[PDB]
Amino acid sequence: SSRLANPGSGQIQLWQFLLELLSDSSNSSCITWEGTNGEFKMTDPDEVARRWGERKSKPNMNYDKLSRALRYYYDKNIMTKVHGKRYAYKFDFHGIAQALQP
Amino acid sequence: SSRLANPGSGQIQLWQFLLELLSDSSNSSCITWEGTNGEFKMTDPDEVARRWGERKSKPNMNYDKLSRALRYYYDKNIMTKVHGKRYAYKFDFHGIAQALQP
Numbered sequence: 001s002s003r004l005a006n007p008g009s010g011q012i013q014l015w016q017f018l019l020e021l022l023s024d025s026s027n028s029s030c031i032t033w034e035g036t037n038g039e040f041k042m043t044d045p046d047e048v049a050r051r052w053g054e055r056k057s058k059p060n061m062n063y064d065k066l067s068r069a070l071r072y073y074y075d076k077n078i079m080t081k082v083h084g085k086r087y088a089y090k091f092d093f094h095g096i097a098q099a100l101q102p
Numbered sequence: 103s104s105r106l107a108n109p110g111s112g113q114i115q116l117w118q119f120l121l122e123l124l125s126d127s128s129n130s131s132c133i134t135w136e137g138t139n140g141e142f143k144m145t146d147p148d149e150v151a152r153r154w155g156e157r158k159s160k161p162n163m164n165y166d167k168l169s170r171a172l173r174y175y176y177d178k179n180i181m182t183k184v185h186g187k188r189y190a191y192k193f194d195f196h197g198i199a200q201a202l203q204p
Contacts, residue, residue, distance in 0.1 A: 007204050016202070023199040037139050038195040093140040093193060097125040100118070102109050 002076055002099045010055060014069050015078050015099070017052060019091070038091040045087050104178055104201045112157060116171050117180050117201070119154060121193070140193040147189050 005012040007020060021027045022040055030047040033040050042048045045063045053061025070089065073079035077095035082088035107114040109122060123129045124142055132149040135142050144150045147165045155163025172191065175181035179197035184190035 004202075007202065019199045019202065023203050033196060037192075090139075091195060093195060093198075094135060096195075097121045100106075100109065100121065101125050 002073075002078055002095070004100055010057070012055065014052065014066075015073060015091070015096070017055060018048075021048070021051070034085075034088065036090075038093060039082060040089055040091070041082075041085060042087040042089075104175075104180055104197070106202055112159070114157065116154065116168075117175060117193070117198070119157060120150075123150070123153070136187075136190065138192075140195060141184060142191055142193070143184075143187060144189040144191075 002013060002015060005016060007016075012020070018031065018040070021031045022033055025032070028043065030044040030051070031040060031042050045066070049061050049063045049066040052066060053059075070079065070081075073095075074081070077092050078099070079089050079091055079095075082090050104115060104117060107118060109118075114122070120133065120142070123133045124135055127134070130145065132146040132153070133142060133144050147168070151163050151165045151168040154168060155161075172181065172183075175197075176183070179194050180201070181191050181193055181197075184192050
């Protein structure tokens with residue numbers, strides 16, 4: 001259900017889009033690794049939502065909606081919110097490993 | 103250099119082979135998640151090496167050699183050994199995320 005797409009594809013899912021941005025340190029002004037395995041923070045959440053909007057060509061993509069989509073992963077063992085930090089989330093390797101299986 | 107292959111492929115790299123086994127809990131008698139994001143343990147290292155040997159059709163694959171190949175990741179920000187535990191290693195999300203990029 002949460003499935004691997006081709007990198008840079010329009011069909012990519014949000015979890016894998018975020019990993020794509022994280023994997024290039026040059027994006028750190030909008031999204032960056034925290035340092036603690038799998039934790040990341042959106043230093044510019046609106047720019048993250050803008051870029052997700054552009055990838056998906058969804059009009060009116062905004063942080064309200066991105067945060068709704070992000071909420072959907074908390075049940076899927078893909079990601080959780082990090083409490084006490086601003087715009088901070090943590091990937092779950094255990095759900096991510098399955099996402100790479102057929 | 104550490105690159106994504108097709109699941110179940112003979113051309114798969116060791117890091118992704120291990121994730122494949124981890125992703126199916128039924129393999130826990132030889133290899134299983136520890137619970138702490140990305141940490142895993144080989145409950146039967148010889149059976150892990152046997153299965154890697156079978157995938158790769160390498161004769162005389164054994165734990166000595168697997169542990170040599172595993173050593174190669176400690177420089178690549180893919181994996182490190184967990185000290186104080188038996189046959190225990192930890193994936194690094196930061197190197198794994200790049201492994202999914204072109």
